[PDB]
């Protein structure tokens, strides 16, 4: 029920001149927006990406970002000159802005900034501040960014007002797409493990949504505690892939099944016998 909205930005600076900035947006585990360096405008990846904003409201908002992207590039370039020769290219900056949605009219907006893959700066209250672990040289950049009263007021409005308003629209507009149910398909296989006389049975599960799923190897009605399931790997069509592995002895795969429960199945659990 608690959906998290994320606006991920990735900025690469190779030298003084060359730089590119790319962005994506996620509502839960669904991409809502894309914005390539090539493109001058933000691309919708869903039909409901505009949400409950009018066309005029979106244009004002898009232009705001269009200005930011140009200004961000130059600011960073100038901040490097300011610190130099303390820090130098190549540089990779990452932003992770967004707002978690809680039931009622409750939310928590955030704007996290990372420098060379290390979370260093955030926007908190009405100003930029560093976090524990951040170098001390960042203090001058922070001092400069906090001097810009206009940027502060704009970001405050963006986090406090715009983010929760906008996302509340998305959840309504893309309700059916968020609450969609897709059935997993399963199939079995085996490979030799590190051990000499040991097999490793694998239970594949693919094409299910949402992410929550239950997969276990079973002997009759006895849970095999050896079962080790891997990571949730994505599919192209916005569904999930998962495999569960169980280490066994060779010639001891008789009466071993893989049970799979999922919300979309609705009672009728999948069972595949070896």
């Amino acid at each position: 029920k608690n959906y998290t909205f994320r606006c991920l930005q990735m900025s690469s600076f190779a030298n003084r001149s060359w730089s590119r900035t790319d962005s994506v947006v996620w509502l839960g585990d669904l991409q809502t927006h894309r914005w390539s360096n090539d493109s001058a405008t933000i691309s919708f990846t869903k039909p409901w990406s505009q949400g409950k904003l009018s066309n005029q409201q979106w244009e004002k908002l898009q232009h705001m970002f269009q200005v930011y992207r140009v200004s961000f590039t130059r600011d960073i370039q100038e901040l490097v000159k300011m610190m130099s020769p303390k820090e130098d290219y190549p540089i990779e900056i990452q932003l992770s802005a967004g707002c978690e949605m809680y039931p009622g009219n409750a939310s928590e907006s955030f704007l996290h900034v990372a420098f060379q893959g290390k979370y260093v700066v955030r926007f908190w209250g009405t100003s930029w501040q560093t976090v524990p672990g951040a170098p001390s040289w960042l203090d001058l950049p922070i001092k400069v960014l906090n001097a810009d009263q206009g940027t502060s007021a704009t970001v405050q409005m963006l986090l406090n007002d715009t983010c929760p308003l906008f996302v509340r629209g998305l959840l309504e507009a893309g309700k059916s797409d968020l609450e969609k149910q897709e059935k997993p398909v399963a199939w079995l296989s085996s490979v030799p493990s590190s051990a000499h006389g040991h097999r490793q049975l694998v239970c594949h599960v693919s094409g299910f949504y949402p992410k929550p799923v239950w997969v276990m190897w079973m002997r009759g009605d006895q849970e095999q505690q050896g079962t080790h399931r891997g990571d949730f790997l994505p599919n192209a069509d916005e569904t999930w892939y998962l495999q569960a592995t169980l280490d066994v002895e060779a010639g001891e795969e008789a009466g071993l099944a893989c049970r799979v429960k999922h919300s979309s199945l609705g009672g009728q659990d999948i069972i595949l016998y070896w």
Partner: T-cell receptor
Amino acid sequence: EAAVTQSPRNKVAVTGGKVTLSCNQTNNHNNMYWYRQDTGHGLRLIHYSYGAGSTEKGDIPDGYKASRPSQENFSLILELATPSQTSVYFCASGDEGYTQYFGPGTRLLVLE
Amino acid sequence: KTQVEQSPQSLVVRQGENCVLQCNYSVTPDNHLRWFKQDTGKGLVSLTVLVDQKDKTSNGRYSATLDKDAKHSTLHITATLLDDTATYICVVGDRGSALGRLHFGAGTQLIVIP
């Protein structure tokens, strides 16, 4: 309160000669700037500095070399003076804020 | 060609009369706008600075306005005196910090007949 001083205030030079425009500032401002004014144009940035040791290229840096030996001084050096550099040169300073406090100006005439 | 254009280029007014100076720009973004006053062979005396979307300012006889939507700014001078004889420069800063660059106009040569 935040005053900035330039020297020389008025200068005559010949083509090929060295000209050194200086700019002292006792405000402890990290950032200092160099502009030139020409009738028909606005003030255009030549060089600027973010601190002692640092010098950066402006809009029209060609023909000029900058030098920031300390927080206070920031010099614009014309290594090989030319008639095209006949102008009024303004120096400025400022902290992290947008405000740039300008100096009184420096007239330069480069004769043949 | 330039990002800041002023109008008129020059004008002549008799002492006691009013005059309005224009300033249009294409600078983006536009944090603030400042009006300078440059007497013959002198420095840059700041008159006022405008920051808001629809800002209004005053400095005795001097007063100015700014519309960021139109990217337009005026400088009204009530009861021109002899000392107003100067060049009036329009400046636009694209940031609210030292990161910003200042975009200068050519100016407006005012001549007050005593």
